[PDB]
Design an enzyme around this catalytic site. Structure first.
Site, PDB file in Angstrom:
ATOM      1  N   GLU A  11       0.603  -1.118   0.081  1.00  0.00           N
ATOM      2  CA  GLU A  11       0.070  -0.031   0.016  1.00  0.00           C
ATOM      3  C   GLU A  11       0.922   1.466  -0.076  1.00  0.00           C
ATOM      4  O   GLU A  11       0.434   2.255  -0.520  1.00  0.00           O
ATOM      5  CB  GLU A  11      -0.942  -0.154   1.326  1.00  0.00           C
ATOM      6  CG  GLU A  11      -1.928  -0.986   1.411  1.00  0.00           C
ATOM      7  CD  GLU A  11      -3.260  -1.120  -0.006  1.00  0.00           C
ATOM      8  OE1 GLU A  11      -3.074  -0.040  -0.508  1.00  0.00           O
ATOM      9  OE2 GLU A  11      -3.677  -1.981  -0.123  1.00  0.00           O
ATOM     10  N   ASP A  20      -6.018   6.606  -5.565  1.00  0.00           N
ATOM     11  CA  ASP A  20      -5.603   4.914  -5.589  1.00  0.00           C
ATOM     12  C   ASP A  20      -5.560   4.602  -7.106  1.00  0.00           C
ATOM     13  O   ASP A  20      -5.818   5.510  -7.991  1.00  0.00           O
ATOM     14  CB  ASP A  20      -6.455   4.042  -4.880  1.00  0.00           C
ATOM     15  CG  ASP A  20      -7.980   3.590  -5.287  1.00  0.00           C
ATOM     16  OD1 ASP A  20      -8.126   3.891  -6.248  1.00  0.00           O
ATOM     17  OD2 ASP A  20      -8.794   3.203  -4.269  1.00  0.00           O
ATOM     18  N   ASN A 132      -6.299 -20.071 -10.601  1.00  0.00           N
ATOM     19  CA  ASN A 132      -7.492 -19.772 -10.526  1.00  0.00           C
ATOM     20  C   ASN A 132      -7.772 -18.217 -10.062  1.00  0.00           C
ATOM     21  O   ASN A 132      -8.544 -17.253 -10.646  1.00  0.00           O
ATOM     22  CB  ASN A 132      -8.530 -20.641  -9.852  1.00  0.00           C
ATOM     23  CG  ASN A 132     -10.043 -20.195  -9.938  1.00  0.00           C
ATOM     24  OD1 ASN A 132     -10.571 -19.482  -8.971  1.00  0.00           O
ATOM     25  ND2 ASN A 132     -10.724 -20.770 -11.063  1.00  0.00           N
TER      26      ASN A 132
END
Ligand SMILES: [Cl-]
Ligand SMILES: [Cl-]
Length: 162
Positions: A11, A20, A132
Site C-alpha cells: 500500500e 488510488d 484460478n
C-alpha cells in the site's frame, strides 16, 4: 514479517489525499475515503475519520491509527463472515496473512466472490488455487501486488516480500 509489514509494502504511506490505482480518494496506508468524485466529499470524510480539520493532510501517527483500525476491521470481518471464516480457520499463519491482505484491498464482499478459489484453498490445492486467482480483474489491474499475494498462497512463505 507480519501483516502490518506486508500491507505497508503493498500500500505505501502517503500523508496527503491521493488517488488510488482505481482513481478513488485515499489517504495514509491504503485507507479509502470515498468513491465519490468529489475532493470535497474526500476532505469531509477525512475530517470525520480523524475527528478534526485536516484539510487533506495527516500525520504519520494518524496514518498508523487508521491502519490499526483497518487491519482490525479486516480481521473481525473475516471471522464474522460465513464464507470466509472456514477458509481462514483451515489455513496456516502465513496464508492467513494473504487472505487478510485480499480482504483489506478488496473488501469482504469482493473476496467472498472468489468462490472457486476459496474452495481450492480450503482443500489445500495450492497450485490450482494460484492459477484460478490469476484469472481475475484483480490480477489484470494490479498484477505485481496480485503476484505477491498469490505466491504467498502458493508457497506458504514470505518469499515474495523478501
Ligand atoms: Cl474510519
Ligand atoms: Cl501492482
Amino acid at each position: 514479517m507480519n501483516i502490518f509489514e506486508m500491507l505497508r509494502i503493498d500500500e505505501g504511506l502517503r500523508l496527503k489525499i491521493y488517488k488510488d490505482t482505481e482513481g478513488y480518494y485515499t489517504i495514509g496506508i491504503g485507507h479509502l475515503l470515498t468513491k465519490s468524485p468529489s475532493l470535497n466529499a474526500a476532505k469531509s470524510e477525512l475530517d470525520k475519520a480523524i475527528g478534526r480539520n485536516c484539510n487533506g493532510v495527516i500525520t504519520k501517527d494518524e496514518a498508523e491509527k487508521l491502519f490499526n483500525q483497518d487491519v482490525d476491521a479486516a480481521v473481525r470481518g473475516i471471522l464474522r463472515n460465513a464464507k470466509l471464516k472456514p477458509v481462514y480457520d483451515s489455513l496456516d499463519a502465513v496464508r492467513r496473512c494473504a487472505l487478510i491482505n485480499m480482504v483489506f484491498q478488496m473488501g469482504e464482499t469482493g473476496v467472498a466472490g472468489f468462490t472457486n478459489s476459496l474452495r481450492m484453498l480450503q482443500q489445500k490445492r495450492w497450485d490450482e488455487a494460484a492459477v484460478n486467482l490469476a484469472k481475475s480483474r484483480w490480477y489484470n489491474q494490479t498484477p505485481n501486488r496480485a503476484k505477491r499475494v498469490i505466491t504467498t498462497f502458493r508457497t506458504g512463505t514470505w518469499d515474495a516480500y523478501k
